[PDB]
C-alpha cells in the first residue's frame, strides 16, 4: 500500500492536478537566508526532470552506492552549475503518500579551507575540453559490462581520444541528484556521478578524486543495458 | 552611399520596424514544390543569427575563399541538420538598399548518384563522437596563426585526443551560410566550414574531403585573433 517513490515521481511530474494536491500550501521556500512561501495560486507546474533524456545521482564515495523500502525521505536536487545555485525539494512519505514539504534555493555549498570545489571543477571539466584533457588521471580506467556471462566486467585503460569518443554527453549547465540517505558532504575528496536514463537502460558512471589538490577523472564505467 | 551588407544585416536583425520596411510584402515563400506568400500582418520578427555566439560560412573548395563591393545579391541560409531542411533568404541591393525579396524552405538538396551526402555526414560527425573519431583523416593537419611575425602560420598534425580538446564547439542541429557568389554544389567532393564570431575575432576553419567514398576531416585551422 505504501507509495513507491519512482512511481509517485513520474505521476507528480506528469499530472498537474496530482502535483498541486501533493504539495504543502503555503509552501515553505528557504532562499537567501530568509523564508518565503509559495501560495497555491502562484504554483507553476514543475515537470522536474521528466523532459530530460537522462538524470544524475551523486555519491561522495563508490561504497555509498551499495544499498530499505521503509525509507520515507527523499531530496531531489537541481545543481545550477553556471549560476552557482542549488534547488532542493523535500519529499516526505506521510501515511504512505509522498508530499512536497519544502523547497530550498540557495548558493551552492562551497568547499572551504582553501580546496578545489567539485562543482566548480566539474563545470569547467564539462565546458572546457582543454581543461578536461588536463584533468584525466593517467591511467584512465574504463569498465564495461562483459557481453557474455552474468555480472561480469571488462576492464581496460583509455587513451585521451578514446575517452572523448566513448564518453556520455556530459551535462554542461545542470546536474541533478536524488538523495535517499547517502552522505552529501562539501568536504569529500572523492565524488561519483551516476548517469541514468528513462526506460532505455542507459547507465554511465564517472569516478572523481582530488589528487594533490586537483580533481581528476579516475574511472569511467559503462553498465548500459 | 551604397549599403554595406554587414551593417544592414545587423540593423535588419536588431530593429523590428526596419526589418518590416525592408521585406517585399506579400513575400514569395517557395516551399514543398509550391509558392506561398507571407502577408505583412503575419510577419514575425526574425533575429536571424544575431542571438548566436558564432555563425558559419560554407565553401565547396578552399580556393573559393579568396575574393567586389559592387555585389548586389546575398543569400543567407539556415541548414536544419536533423529535419533535413534548408531555409534561404534572398537579399538584393536595390538603389543601394538591401531588401528581402523571397524565401525558400525546402528539403535539403541531397547528393544523388549514390554518394555520401556532406550534411548527412556532418550531422553524424558532430553528434556521434565514435563516428567522428573514425572520420578523422590520418594524419589530421592543424594550422594556427604564428604568435610572432605577420601573416605567418604554424603547422602540425593532431592526435585524436588533441582534436577533441582543441576543436571548436561543433554545431549539432544547425549550420548557416552566407552565399555571396561562391559555388554551392551538392556534387562537390570537398567542403569547407568557416566558423566566425561576432566582434570577438574568433575564426576556426574545417576542411573536409570525400576519400574513397567517405567524408573525412582533412584539416583544422584556428586563425582566431
Ligand atoms: Cl543531469
Ligand atoms: Cl589519460
Ligand atoms: Cl593526494
Ligand atoms: Cl552555426
Ligand atoms: Cl587522427
Ligand atoms: Cl589520443
Ligand atoms: Cl578517393
Coordinates of C-alpha atoms and ligand atoms in Angstrom, one line a residue:
Chain A
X1 CA 0.0 0.0 0.0
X2 CA 2.9 2.5 0.7
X3 CA 3.8 4.5 -2.4
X4 CA 7.0 3.7 -4.3
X5 CA 8.9 7.0 -4.9
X6 CA 9.7 6.2 -8.6
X7 CA 6.0 5.6 -9.4
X8 CA 4.9 8.7 -7.4
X9 CA 7.7 10.8 -9.1
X10 CA 6.6 10.0 -12.6
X11 CA 2.9 10.8 -11.7
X12 CA 3.8 14.0 -9.8
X13 CA 5.9 15.3 -12.8
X14 CA 3.3 14.4 -15.5
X15 CA -0.1 15.2 -13.8
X16 CA -0.8 18.9 -13.0
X17 CA -3.8 18.3 -10.6
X18 CA -1.9 15.5 -8.8
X19 CA 1.2 17.7 -8.4
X20 CA -0.9 20.6 -6.9
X21 CA -2.6 18.1 -4.5
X22 CA 0.7 16.7 -3.2
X23 CA 2.4 20.0 -2.2
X24 CA 2.1 21.7 1.2
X25 CA 0.5 25.2 0.6
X26 CA 1.6 27.9 1.6
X27 CA 4.9 26.1 0.6
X28 CA 8.0 27.0 2.8
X29 CA 10.6 28.3 0.4
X30 CA 14.1 28.8 2.0
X31 CA 16.1 31.2 0.0
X32 CA 18.8 33.9 0.5
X33 CA 19.0 33.3 4.3
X34 CA 15.2 34.0 4.6
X35 CA 12.0 32.1 4.3
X36 CA 9.3 32.7 1.7
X37 CA 6.1 30.9 1.0
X38 CA 4.7 29.9 -2.4
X39 CA 0.9 30.3 -2.5
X40 CA -1.2 27.6 -4.2
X41 CA -2.5 30.3 -6.7
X42 CA 1.2 31.1 -7.6
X43 CA 2.4 27.5 -8.3
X44 CA 3.7 26.8 -11.8
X45 CA 3.7 23.1 -12.8
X46 CA 7.2 21.7 -12.3
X47 CA 8.0 18.9 -14.8
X48 CA 11.2 18.4 -12.7
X49 CA 13.5 16.2 -15.0
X50 CA 10.7 14.3 -16.9
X51 CA 11.6 16.2 -20.2
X52 CA 15.3 15.1 -19.9
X53 CA 16.7 12.1 -21.6
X54 CA 18.9 11.3 -18.6
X55 CA 19.5 12.4 -15.0
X56 CA 22.3 12.1 -12.4
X57 CA 22.6 10.7 -8.9
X58 CA 25.6 11.8 -6.8
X59 CA 27.7 9.9 -4.2
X60 CA 30.7 11.1 -2.0
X61 CA 32.2 7.6 -2.4
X62 CA 31.8 4.5 -4.6
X63 CA 30.9 2.3 -1.5
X64 CA 27.9 4.7 -0.7
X65 CA 26.2 3.2 -3.9
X66 CA 25.6 -0.3 -2.3
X67 CA 22.2 0.0 -0.5
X68 CA 15.3 -0.1 2.8
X69 CA 11.8 0.5 1.2
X70 CA 10.9 1.8 4.8
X71 CA 12.6 5.0 3.5
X72 CA 10.3 8.0 3.9
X73 CA 12.5 10.9 2.9
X74 CA 13.8 11.8 -0.5
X75 CA 15.6 15.0 -1.5
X76 CA 15.5 15.9 -5.2
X77 CA 18.2 18.4 -6.3
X78 CA 18.9 20.7 -9.3
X79 CA 22.5 21.9 -9.5
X80 CA 22.8 25.2 -11.4
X81 CA 26.5 25.0 -12.4
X82 CA 26.8 28.4 -14.1
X83 CA 24.6 30.4 -11.5
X84 CA 26.3 28.6 -8.6
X85 CA 22.9 27.6 -7.2
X86 CA 21.1 24.5 -5.9
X87 CA 17.4 23.9 -5.7
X88 CA 16.2 21.2 -3.2
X89 CA 12.8 19.5 -3.0
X90 CA 12.0 17.8 0.3
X91 CA 9.7 14.8 -0.4
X92 CA 8.3 13.0 2.6
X93 CA 6.2 9.8 2.7
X94 CA 3.2 10.5 5.0
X95 CA 0.7 7.8 5.7
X96 CA 2.2 6.0 2.7
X97 CA 1.8 9.1 0.4
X98 CA 4.6 11.3 -0.9
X99 CA 4.3 15.0 -0.3
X100 CA 6.4 18.1 -1.1
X101 CA 7.1 19.7 2.3
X102 CA 9.6 22.5 1.5
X103 CA 12.0 23.9 -1.1
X104 CA 15.5 25.3 -0.7
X105 CA 17.0 27.7 -3.4
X106 CA 20.4 28.6 -2.1
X107 CA 24.1 29.4 -3.0
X108 CA 25.9 26.2 -4.0
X109 CA 27.5 25.0 -0.7
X110 CA 31.2 25.7 -1.4
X111 CA 34.2 23.7 -0.2
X112 CA 36.0 26.0 2.3
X113 CA 39.5 25.7 4.0
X114 CA 41.1 26.6 0.5
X115 CA 40.4 23.4 -1.5
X116 CA 39.2 22.9 -5.1
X117 CA 35.4 22.7 -5.1
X118 CA 34.0 19.7 -7.0
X119 CA 31.1 21.6 -8.8
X120 CA 33.4 24.5 -9.9
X121 CA 35.8 21.8 -11.2
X122 CA 33.0 19.8 -12.9
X123 CA 31.6 22.9 -14.6
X124 CA 35.0 23.7 -16.2
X125 CA 35.7 19.9 -16.9
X126 CA 32.4 19.7 -18.9
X127 CA 32.7 23.1 -20.7
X128 CA 36.4 23.4 -21.4
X129 CA 37.7 20.4 -23.4
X130 CA 41.4 21.6 -22.9
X131 CA 40.9 21.7 -19.1
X132 CA 39.0 18.4 -19.4
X133 CA 42.0 16.7 -21.1
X134 CA 44.5 18.1 -18.4
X135 CA 42.3 16.5 -15.6
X136 CA 42.2 12.9 -16.8
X137 CA 44.1 10.7 -14.5
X138 CA 46.9 8.6 -16.0
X139 CA 45.9 5.9 -16.4
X140 CA 42.2 6.4 -17.1
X141 CA 40.3 3.2 -16.1
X142 CA 37.4 2.0 -18.3
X143 CA 34.9 -0.7 -17.1
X144 CA 32.1 -2.1 -19.2
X145 CA 29.6 -5.0 -18.9
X146 CA 31.0 -8.2 -20.4
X147 CA 28.7 -9.1 -23.4
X148 CA 28.9 -12.7 -22.3
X149 CA 28.4 -14.3 -18.7
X150 CA 26.2 -12.7 -16.0
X151 CA 27.6 -9.9 -13.6
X152 CA 31.0 -9.9 -15.4
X153 CA 33.0 -6.8 -16.3
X154 CA 35.7 -5.9 -18.9
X155 CA 38.5 -3.6 -17.6
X156 CA 41.0 -1.6 -19.8
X157 CA 42.6 1.9 -19.8
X158 CA 41.6 4.7 -22.1
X159 CA 43.7 7.0 -24.3
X160 CA 42.5 10.6 -24.4
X161 CA 41.0 10.1 -27.8
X162 CA 39.0 7.1 -26.7
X163 CA 37.7 8.9 -23.6
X164 CA 36.3 11.8 -25.8
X165 CA 34.8 9.3 -28.4
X166 CA 33.1 7.0 -25.8
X167 CA 32.2 9.5 -23.1
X168 CA 28.4 10.2 -22.4
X169 CA 27.2 13.7 -23.4
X170 CA 28.4 15.5 -20.3
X171 CA 25.8 17.9 -18.7
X172 CA 27.2 21.4 -19.1
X173 CA 24.7 23.7 -17.2
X174 CA 22.9 21.4 -14.7
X175 CA 23.4 18.3 -12.7
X176 CA 20.7 16.5 -10.7
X177 CA 20.7 14.5 -7.5
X178 CA 18.3 12.0 -5.8
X179 CA 19.3 11.9 -2.2
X180 CA 17.8 8.9 -0.5
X181 CA 20.2 9.0 2.5
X182 CA 23.8 8.8 1.1
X183 CA 26.4 11.3 2.5
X184 CA 26.4 14.7 0.8
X185 CA 29.4 16.5 2.2
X186 CA 31.1 19.5 0.7
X187 CA 34.5 18.3 2.1
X188 CA 34.7 14.8 0.4
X189 CA 37.9 14.3 -1.7
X190 CA 36.0 11.7 -3.8
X191 CA 32.9 12.1 -5.9
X192 CA 30.8 9.9 -8.2
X193 CA 28.4 11.0 -11.0
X194 CA 25.9 8.2 -11.9
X195 CA 24.1 9.0 -15.1
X196 CA 20.8 7.1 -15.7
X197 CA 18.2 7.2 -18.5
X198 CA 14.4 6.8 -18.6
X199 CA 13.4 3.3 -19.7
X200 CA 16.3 2.9 -22.1
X201 CA 18.7 1.0 -19.7
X202 CA 21.4 3.7 -20.1
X203 CA 23.9 3.7 -17.2
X204 CA 27.3 5.6 -17.2
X205 CA 29.2 6.2 -14.0
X206 CA 32.1 8.7 -13.5
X207 CA 34.5 8.5 -10.6
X208 CA 36.5 11.5 -9.5
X209 CA 39.2 12.1 -6.9
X210 CA 41.0 15.3 -5.6
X211 CA 44.7 14.2 -6.1
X212 CA 47.4 16.6 -4.8
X213 CA 44.8 19.4 -4.7
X214 CA 43.2 18.8 -8.1
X215 CA 40.1 16.8 -9.0
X216 CA 40.8 14.2 -11.7
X217 CA 38.6 11.7 -13.6
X218 CA 39.7 8.3 -12.2
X219 CA 37.3 5.9 -13.9
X220 CA 34.5 5.7 -16.5
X221 CA 32.2 2.7 -16.2
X222 CA 29.5 2.0 -18.9
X223 CA 27.0 -0.5 -17.4
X224 CA 24.3 0.4 -20.1
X225 CA 21.8 -2.5 -20.8
Chain B
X1 CA 26.2 55.8 -50.3
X2 CA 25.5 52.0 -51.2
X3 CA 24.7 50.0 -48.1
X4 CA 27.2 47.5 -46.8
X5 CA 25.6 44.1 -46.3
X6 CA 27.2 43.5 -42.8
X7 CA 25.9 46.9 -41.5
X8 CA 22.4 46.4 -43.0
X9 CA 22.3 42.8 -41.6
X10 CA 23.0 43.9 -38.0
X11 CA 20.3 46.6 -38.3
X12 CA 17.7 44.3 -40.0
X13 CA 18.2 41.6 -37.3
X14 CA 18.0 44.1 -34.4
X15 CA 15.3 46.7 -35.4
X16 CA 11.7 45.4 -35.9
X17 CA 10.4 48.4 -37.8
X18 CA 13.4 48.4 -40.1
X19 CA 13.0 44.7 -40.8
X20 CA 9.3 45.1 -41.7
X21 CA 10.2 48.0 -44.0
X22 CA 12.9 46.1 -45.9
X23 CA 10.9 43.0 -46.9
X24 CA 8.7 42.6 -50.0
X25 CA 5.0 42.1 -48.9
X26 CA 3.2 39.8 -49.8
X27 CA 6.5 37.8 -49.5
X28 CA 7.0 35.0 -52.0
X29 CA 7.7 31.8 -49.9
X30 CA 8.8 28.8 -52.0
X31 CA 8.1 25.7 -50.1
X32 CA 7.1 22.0 -50.8
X33 CA 7.1 22.5 -54.7
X34 CA 4.6 25.3 -54.3
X35 CA 4.6 29.0 -53.7
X36 CA 3.0 30.7 -50.7
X37 CA 3.0 34.3 -49.6
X38 CA 3.7 35.8 -46.2
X39 CA 1.4 38.8 -45.5
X40 CA 2.9 41.8 -43.7
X41 CA 0.3 41.3 -40.9
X42 CA 1.6 37.7 -40.4
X43 CA 5.4 38.5 -40.3
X44 CA 7.2 37.5 -37.0
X45 CA 10.5 39.4 -36.3
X46 CA 13.4 37.2 -37.4
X47 CA 16.5 37.8 -35.4
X48 CA 18.3 35.5 -37.9
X49 CA 21.6 34.6 -36.2
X50 CA 22.1 37.7 -34.1
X51 CA 21.4 35.7 -30.8
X52 CA 24.2 33.2 -31.8
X53 CA 27.8 33.5 -30.5
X54 CA 29.1 32.3 -33.9
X55 CA 28.0 31.5 -37.5
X56 CA 29.3 29.5 -40.4
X57 CA 30.1 30.3 -44.0
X58 CA 30.4 27.4 -46.4
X59 CA 32.7 26.8 -49.5
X60 CA 32.9 23.8 -52.0
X61 CA 36.7 24.3 -52.1
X62 CA 39.4 26.2 -50.2
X63 CA 40.3 28.3 -53.3
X64 CA 36.7 29.7 -53.4
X65 CA 37.5 31.6 -50.1
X66 CA 39.9 34.1 -51.9
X67 CA 37.7 37.0 -53.1
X68 CA 33.8 43.1 -55.4
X69 CA 31.7 45.7 -53.2
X70 CA 29.6 46.0 -56.5
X71 CA 27.9 42.8 -55.3
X72 CA 24.1 43.2 -55.0
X73 CA 23.0 39.7 -54.2
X74 CA 23.4 37.8 -50.9
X75 CA 21.7 34.5 -49.9
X76 CA 21.5 33.8 -46.2
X77 CA 20.9 30.2 -45.3
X78 CA 19.8 28.1 -42.3
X79 CA 20.7 24.4 -42.5
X80 CA 18.3 22.3 -40.3
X81 CA 20.5 19.2 -40.0
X82 CA 18.0 16.9 -38.1
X83 CA 14.9 17.9 -40.1
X84 CA 16.8 17.7 -43.4
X85 CA 15.7 21.2 -44.3
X86 CA 17.2 24.5 -45.7
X87 CA 15.7 28.0 -45.3
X88 CA 17.1 30.6 -47.8
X89 CA 16.7 34.4 -47.7
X90 CA 17.2 36.2 -51.0
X91 CA 18.7 39.7 -50.2
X92 CA 19.0 42.1 -53.1
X93 CA 20.7 45.5 -53.1
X94 CA 18.2 47.9 -54.9
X95 CA 19.1 51.5 -55.4
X96 CA 21.8 50.9 -52.8
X97 CA 19.3 49.5 -50.2
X98 CA 19.2 45.8 -49.2
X99 CA 15.7 44.2 -49.4
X100 CA 14.3 40.7 -48.7
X101 CA 12.9 39.5 -52.0
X102 CA 11.9 35.9 -51.3
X103 CA 12.3 32.9 -49.0
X104 CA 12.8 29.2 -49.8
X105 CA 12.0 26.5 -47.2
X106 CA 12.8 23.2 -48.9
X107 CA 14.2 19.7 -48.5
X108 CA 18.0 19.7 -48.1
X109 CA 19.3 19.2 -51.7
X110 CA 20.7 15.7 -51.4
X111 CA 23.7 14.4 -53.3
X112 CA 22.4 11.8 -55.8
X113 CA 24.2 9.1 -58.0
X114 CA 24.8 7.0 -54.8
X115 CA 27.4 9.2 -52.9
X116 CA 27.7 10.1 -49.2
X117 CA 26.0 13.4 -48.6
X118 CA 28.1 16.1 -46.8
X119 CA 25.3 17.3 -44.5
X120 CA 24.1 13.8 -43.5
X121 CA 27.8 13.1 -42.8
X122 CA 28.3 16.3 -40.8
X123 CA 25.2 15.7 -38.7
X124 CA 26.6 12.3 -37.6
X125 CA 30.2 13.7 -37.3
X126 CA 29.0 16.4 -34.8
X127 CA 26.5 14.2 -32.9
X128 CA 28.3 10.9 -32.7
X129 CA 31.8 11.2 -31.2
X130 CA 32.6 7.5 -32.1
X131 CA 31.7 8.1 -35.8
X132 CA 33.6 11.5 -35.5
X133 CA 36.8 9.7 -34.4
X134 CA 36.5 7.1 -37.3
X135 CA 36.3 10.0 -39.9
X136 CA 39.5 11.9 -38.9
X137 CA 42.0 11.7 -41.7
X138 CA 45.4 10.2 -40.8
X139 CA 47.3 12.5 -40.5
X140 CA 45.0 15.3 -39.3
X141 CA 46.5 18.7 -40.1
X142 CA 46.4 21.6 -37.7
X143 CA 47.3 25.2 -38.7
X144 CA 47.3 28.2 -36.3
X145 CA 48.4 31.8 -36.6
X146 CA 52.0 32.2 -35.5
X147 CA 52.1 34.4 -32.3
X148 CA 55.1 36.2 -33.7
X149 CA 55.6 37.8 -37.3
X150 CA 52.7 39.0 -39.5
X151 CA 50.8 36.6 -41.9
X152 CA 52.8 33.6 -40.6
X153 CA 51.3 30.1 -39.7
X154 CA 52.4 27.2 -37.5
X155 CA 51.6 23.7 -38.9
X156 CA 51.5 20.4 -37.1
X157 CA 49.4 17.1 -37.0
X158 CA 46.9 16.3 -34.3
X159 CA 46.4 13.1 -32.3
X160 CA 42.7 12.2 -31.8
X161 CA 42.8 13.5 -28.1
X162 CA 44.2 16.9 -29.2
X163 CA 41.5 17.3 -31.9
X164 CA 38.7 16.7 -29.3
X165 CA 40.5 19.1 -26.8
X166 CA 41.1 22.0 -29.2
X167 CA 38.1 21.7 -31.6
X168 CA 35.5 24.5 -31.6
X169 CA 32.1 23.6 -30.1
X170 CA 30.7 21.9 -33.2
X171 CA 27.1 23.0 -34.3
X172 CA 24.9 19.9 -33.8
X173 CA 21.4 20.9 -35.1
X174 CA 22.0 23.8 -37.5
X175 CA 24.6 25.3 -39.8
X176 CA 24.4 28.7 -41.5
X177 CA 25.7 30.0 -44.8
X178 CA 26.3 33.5 -46.3
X179 CA 26.4 32.9 -50.0
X180 CA 27.9 36.0 -51.8
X181 CA 28.6 34.2 -55.1
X182 CA 30.8 31.1 -54.2
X183 CA 29.8 27.7 -55.8
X184 CA 27.2 25.8 -53.8
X185 CA 27.1 22.4 -55.5
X186 CA 25.6 19.3 -54.0
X187 CA 28.2 17.2 -56.0
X188 CA 31.5 18.7 -54.6
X189 CA 33.8 16.0 -53.1
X190 CA 35.4 18.8 -50.9
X191 CA 33.7 21.1 -48.4
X192 CA 34.8 23.9 -46.0
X193 CA 33.1 25.1 -42.8
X194 CA 34.4 28.5 -41.8
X195 CA 33.2 29.4 -38.2
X196 CA 33.2 33.1 -37.4
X197 CA 32.2 35.1 -34.2
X198 CA 30.6 38.4 -33.6
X199 CA 33.2 41.1 -32.6
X200 CA 35.4 38.6 -30.7
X201 CA 37.8 37.8 -33.6
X202 CA 37.1 34.1 -33.4
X203 CA 37.8 32.2 -36.6
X204 CA 38.1 28.4 -37.0
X205 CA 38.0 26.6 -40.3
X206 CA 37.3 22.9 -41.0
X207 CA 38.4 21.2 -44.3
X208 CA 36.6 18.1 -45.4
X209 CA 37.1 15.7 -48.4
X210 CA 35.2 12.6 -49.6
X211 CA 38.1 10.0 -49.8
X212 CA 37.3 6.5 -51.2
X213 CA 33.5 7.3 -50.8
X214 CA 33.7 8.7 -47.2
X215 CA 33.9 12.2 -46.0
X216 CA 36.9 12.8 -43.7
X217 CA 38.1 15.8 -41.7
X218 CA 41.4 16.8 -43.5
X219 CA 42.5 19.9 -41.6
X220 CA 41.6 22.3 -38.7
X221 CA 42.8 25.8 -38.9
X222 CA 42.5 28.2 -36.0
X223 CA 43.0 31.8 -37.2
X224 CA 41.4 33.4 -34.1
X225 CA 42.5 36.9 -33.2
Ligands
LIG1 CL1 21.5 15.9 -15.5
LIG2 CL1 44.5 9.6 -20.0
LIG3 CL1 46.7 13.4 -2.7
LIG4 CL1 26.1 27.9 -37.0
LIG5 CL1 44.0 11.4 -36.4
LIG6 CL1 44.9 10.2 -28.2
LIG7 CL1 39.3 9.0 -53.5

